[PDB]
Structure formats: structure tokens, C-alpha cells
Design a protein around this ligand. Structure first.
Ligand SMILES: CCCCCCCCCC(=O)N(CCO)C[C@@H](O)[C@@H](O)[C@@H](O)[C@@H](O)CO
Ligand SMILES: CCCCCCCCCC(=O)N(CCO)C[C@@H](O)[C@@H](O)[C@@H](O)[C@@H](O)CO
Ligand SMILES: CCCCCCCCCC(=O)N(CCO)C[C@@H](O)[C@@H](O)[C@@H](O)[C@@H](O)CO
Ligand SMILES: CCCCCCCCCC(=O)N(CCO)C[C@@H](O)[C@@H](O)[C@@H](O)[C@@H](O)CO
Ligand code: NA
Ligand code: NA
Lengths: 90, 92, 90, 92
């Protein structure tokens, strides 16, 4: 549980630095700075408007952006599910 | 299960009083009164339009509002998941 | 599993008859007929746009409509979760 | 776990070929090619905007499209849930 929760903040800082870098100058509202990018990656993590709201407009500028966003989900939405199950078991 | 379900209504009254207070006069549609604030915090709890719909417009007036909304989710969306698992366990 | 799956179709016919009746003439796009009402109650069941999309516009005409929609969710989104767990166990 | 993960990519190729075929010429933005159709079926799989965003506009042209989209969900959103549970079990 402890080793998993730490890995999640590490993955969330590496993606939040990257999302600010790649889609910063192009999408300043959602990917302006690290904090802006953290808040928006979390929105994508809870699945809220992930595709139609953020993931789709970004592809219209950066067509390959799905390589960033789809794997992040297949990871973060698995991790959190595994982490929460770990809490109940322990 | 009983001790958890009661804690959920307590957390939902403390946040519903707070959400009406902080974002009331500024966002009367979603945070006008306790009932309005209860219904909207629940929308945030089920994750439905949470960010793009409510959480984002509120930050454009109250930039720190994320300190209220992100923790509420990391709590209420964990509690309900743990509560529902508790029901199934206390049956088998 | 069998006794639960049958209860779900029964609850989905009683609500689909009711939703067509209450919010029919007022909201014909989403609650016109039984089938229209079934499809829309399912959208509410998967939580997709449930509040901002359907539940909110309906309250602006029928203020108490939340008494119909919130309990339906606390039931159908629990039932399906319990049913799917039952399949994996059996 | 291995036999389930392979079945998921097989179901996702059979639907992605079909979605491109049926709703291609009519909905080129979301169902233009196999890749476009894969990405959009996945959006439907995670439930994100599934109904109000994609499933509803498509029915206004193809009224029976719900026969394609509702079963896909009752399958893919069950499979992934069962697959993820299989991973946790094959670890403890
Ligand atoms: C997973 C499906 C990803 C589909 C995809 O790669 N694209 C279609 C998205 O519509 C974008 C490409 O065509 C460019 O990267
Ligand atoms: C965790 C996410 C925090 C997001 C965040 O703090 N900001 C981005 C969201 O605006 C910037 C804030 O400084 C404002 O309050
Ligand atoms: C659960 C919260 C329900 C809140 C509620 O009942 N209303 C506020 C919805 O904003 C509507 C009433 O004021 C009328 O029925
Ligand atoms: C299960 C839901 C089925 C919904 C449905 O069949 N219709 C409502 C959605 O339009 C009407 C159809 O006859 C069209 O195809
Ligand atoms: Na969701
Ligand atoms: Na959503």
C-alpha cells in the first residue's frame, strides 16, 4: 500500500512535467504549468470528460497525443483501483 | 457498515454547509442553499461532469477551490467503494 | 446471480414506464416512449452525463425529479456492481 | 488473465472494423478509419461522454445503432473489470 501510493505521486510528477512541456504553449489553459498539468491529469485519471473535453482538442494540434493519454489511463485507473483494494485487505 | 454510512451523511452535511458558504453568492445555481449544495456535491461524488462542469468555473473566481473539491473526491469516492464492499462481505 | 439479473429488468421496466409518464410531454427527446426512457435511464445508470445533461434540465420543470433520479442511481449502480461480483465469485 | 487480454483485442478489432463500416461515411470524425474507430470505441468503453457525445448523434442518422453500442458496453466494461480482478488475484 505504501510502496504503491509513493509510485503514484512519482508517475504523476513525471507526466505533469511532460504534459506542461509538450502541450504547454499550445494548450495554456489545461497544460500551462506543473500544477495546471497535475489538476488536468487527475481529471483524466477520474475519467471525467477525458476524451471529448481534453484528449480530443489536443490531438487536433498534436495527433499522436493519444500515446501519452491512453497509457496514462490504463496505468493510473488500474493503480488507484489496486491501491484502494489494498487498503480494504490490510 | 452502519458506522460508515452515518459518517458519510456527517461528511456530506459539513461540506454542504461549507460549499453553500464559500461559493454561494458567486455560484447561486449550484451552491445557493444546503440542498442545492448537497445535490451538486453528490454529482462531484459520482464524478459526473465534476471537473469541466463545476470544479473548473468555480476556480476562475475562487482559484484555491481545488483544495475543497479534490480531497472531497479522494474521500467520498473511496468511502462509497469501501461501504459497498462491506455490504457484499456482510452477506456471504 | 439469476435472481438479481431478473430483479434488474423488473426495476428497469417500472422506472421506464414512470419516466415516460412523468417527464414525457415535457421532455419528449429523452422520455417520449418506454424504449426512449429505457435508453436514457441506462445512460443515468452508467453515470454518463447523468446530472448536467439530463437530471438538471428536468428539475427546471419538475423540481422534485431528483427523488426519482438519485435513488435509481443508489440502487442500479449498486445492483450492477453486486451482480458483476456475483459472476466472478460463481 | 492471458486468455482474457487476447479476447479483448480480438473484440476491439471486430467492433473497430464494424464501426468504421456502418458509421464511417456518415460520422467521419469519430468513425472514419479503424484507428479513429478504435480510439472512439475505447472512449465508449471507459463510459466517457458515451451517450450524450457519440451514441446519441449516431442514432439520429442510424436509429438502431444502440444494438451495436449498448452490448459493447455490457461486455467491454465487464471484461476489463473481470481482467483487473484477475491480475490482483494472480498476485496474492
Ligand atoms: C488507440 C487508438 C489510437 C488511434 C490513433 O492513433 N489515432 C486516431 C485518432 O482519431 C491518431 C493517429 O491517426 C495519429 O497519431
Ligand atoms: C493537485 C492539483 C493542484 C492544482 C493547483 O494547485 N493549481 C492548478 C489549477 O488551477 C494552481 C493553484 O495555484 C490555483 O489555486
Ligand atoms: C439530495 C439533494 C436534493 C436537493 C433538492 O431536493 N433540490 C435542490 C436541487 O438544486 C430540489 C428541491 O429544492 C425541490 O425539489
Ligand atoms: C434498451 C434500450 C433500447 C432503446 C430503443 O430501442 N429505442 C430508444 C432510443 O432511440 C428506440 C429504437 O426503436 C430506435 O432504434
Ligand atoms: Na464515469
Ligand atoms: Na462523465
Amino acid at each position: 500500500v505504501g510502496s504503491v501510493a509513493a509510485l503514484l505521486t512519482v508517475v504523476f510528477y513525471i507526466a505533469a512535467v511532460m504534459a506542461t512541456n509538450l502541450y504547454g504553449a499550445t494548450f495554456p489553459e489545461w497544460f500551462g504549468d506543473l500544477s495546471k498539468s497535475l489538476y488536468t491529469l487527475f481529471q483524466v485519471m477520474t475519467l471525467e470528460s477525458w476524451s471529448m473535453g481534453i484528449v480530443r482538442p489536443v490531438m487536433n494540434v498534436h495527433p499522436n497525443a493519444w500515446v501519452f493519454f491512453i497509457p496514462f489511463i490504463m496505468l493510473t485507473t488500474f493503480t488507484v483501483l489496486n491501491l484502494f483494494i489494498g487498503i480494504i485487505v490490510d
